[PDB]
Amino acid sequence: IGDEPLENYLDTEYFGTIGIGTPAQDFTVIFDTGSSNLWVPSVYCSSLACSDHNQFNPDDSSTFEATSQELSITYGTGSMTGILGYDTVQVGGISDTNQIFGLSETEPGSFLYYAPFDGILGLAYPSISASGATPVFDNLWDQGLVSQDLFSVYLSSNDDSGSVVLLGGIDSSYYTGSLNWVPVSVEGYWQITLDSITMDGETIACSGGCQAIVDTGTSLLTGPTSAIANIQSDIGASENSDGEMVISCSSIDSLPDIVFTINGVQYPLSPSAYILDSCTSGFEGMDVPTSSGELWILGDVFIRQYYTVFDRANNKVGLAPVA
Numbered sequence: 001i002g003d004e005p006l007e008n009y010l011d012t013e014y015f016g017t018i019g020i021g022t023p024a025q026d027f028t029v030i031f032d033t034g035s036s037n038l039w040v041p042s043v044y045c046s047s048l049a050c051s052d053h054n055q056f057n058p059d060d061s062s063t064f065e066a067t068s069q070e071l072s073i074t075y076g077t078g079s080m081t082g083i084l085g086y087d088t089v090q091v092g093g094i095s096d097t098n099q100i101f102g103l104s105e106t107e108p109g110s111f112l113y114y115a116p117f118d119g120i121l122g123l124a125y126p127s128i129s130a131s132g133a134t135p136v137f138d139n140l141w142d143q144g145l146v147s148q149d150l151f152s153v154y155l156s157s158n159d160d161s162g163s164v165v166l167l168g169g170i171d172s173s174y175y176t177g178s179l180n181w182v183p184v185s186v187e188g189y190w191q192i193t194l195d196s197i198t199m200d201g202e203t204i205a206c207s208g209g210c211q212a213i214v215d216t217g218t219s220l221l222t223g224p225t226s227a228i229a230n231i232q233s234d235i236g237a238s239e240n241s242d243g244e245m246v247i248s249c250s251s252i253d254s255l256p257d258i259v260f261t262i263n264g265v266q267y268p269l270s271p272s273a274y275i276l277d278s279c280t281s282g283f284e285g286m287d288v289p290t291s292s293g294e295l296w297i298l299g300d301v302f303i304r305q306y307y308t309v310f311d312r313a314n315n316k317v318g319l320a321p322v323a
């Protein structure tokens with residue numbers, strides 16, 4: 001069982017340190033349950049974001065093995081191109097030998113330039129991995145480096161230490177109540193079916209059910225723009241001169257919970273959770289069309305309240321209230 005500590009950056013990004021190569025070269029990476037590739041910047045990249053982050057040098061690693069395979073990835077915000085290579089990745093105390101990963105050759109745009117992390121370590125299914133690159137957790141399981149084919153995530157609140165990805169384990173000191181299990185509706189993301197979203201007993205969005213993904217790599221709780229607009233109006237959030245969804249901090253003590261029903265079980269978010277003396281909404285409209293329908297994203301606003309188990313043996317997500 002391996003523990004990967006995560007730094008809680010402003011309650012907005014959660015990244016941990018990994019080592020790549022022999023001797024290890026260290027990188028910070030977002031542990032991203034919304035994607036499946038591992039990549040870091042490399043000495044082959046001249047983009048600005050490469051210049052202001054740690055760059056992998058395969059020349060200095062005695063265990064590196066080159067490939068002729070290229071890689072390209074476009075995220076919601078940010079993108080990269082590069083080349084795949086193999087090396088040993090130290091992650092959570094585990095020596096992940098023979099791990100394929102991306103060495104960036106371009107990283108355009110300001111988001112990656114201003115972000116504190118060097119790269120991204122995806123934790124989702126192989127079906128959405130660019131170039132069919134084996135995801136880290138698949139390679140761990142393939143090599144028997146974890147005995148149980150699952151991992152769990154605790155994300156801390158209030159910029160506190162203690163966030164972790166627990167590779168191969170579930171730890172009940174991080175939660176209370178019973179874990180409830182949700183089948184993965186479509187294997188790619190950690191995608192699940194939401195039944196309803198309610199406030200003070202009435203349905204405010206997702207009437208008749210909708211699709212959602214559980215994504216540590218997204219800060220906010222996002223949904224289709226039209227639905228989110230209603231929710232913003234429902235909680236009293238107004239966009240201001242600067243493009244921020246502003247809300248009176250006094251509503252934190254006024255407003256009722258917003259309740260997500262998932263597989264028939266109610267998961268409340270208190271206004272303490274879905275309102276971030278500058279208070280803004282934890283919701284954001286973002287349209288993610290798929291053959292499944294538009295996706296909602298249960299990002300860190302949600303995951304901070306629910307210890308989450310990602311079970312690849314079973315293709316299920318487990319949820320329980322954080323301790």
Ligand SMILES: CC(C)CN(C[C@@H](O)[C@H](Cc1ccccc1)NC(=O)O[C@H]1CO[C@H]2OCC[C@H]21)S(=O)(=O)c1ccc(N)cc1
Pocket residue numbers: 030032033034035036073074075076077078111120128130215217218219288
């Ligand atoms: C780069 C990540 C650390 C951040 N992203 C979260 C990530 O989970 C998204 C979450 C996501 C998912 C779907 C649509 C938009 C965003 N996944 C994603 O874009 O996956 C990509 C992998 O290759 C492609 O195939 C799947 C989608 C692409 S992100 O949505 O782009 C993002 C970027 C900036 C901020 N501030 C907040 C979120």
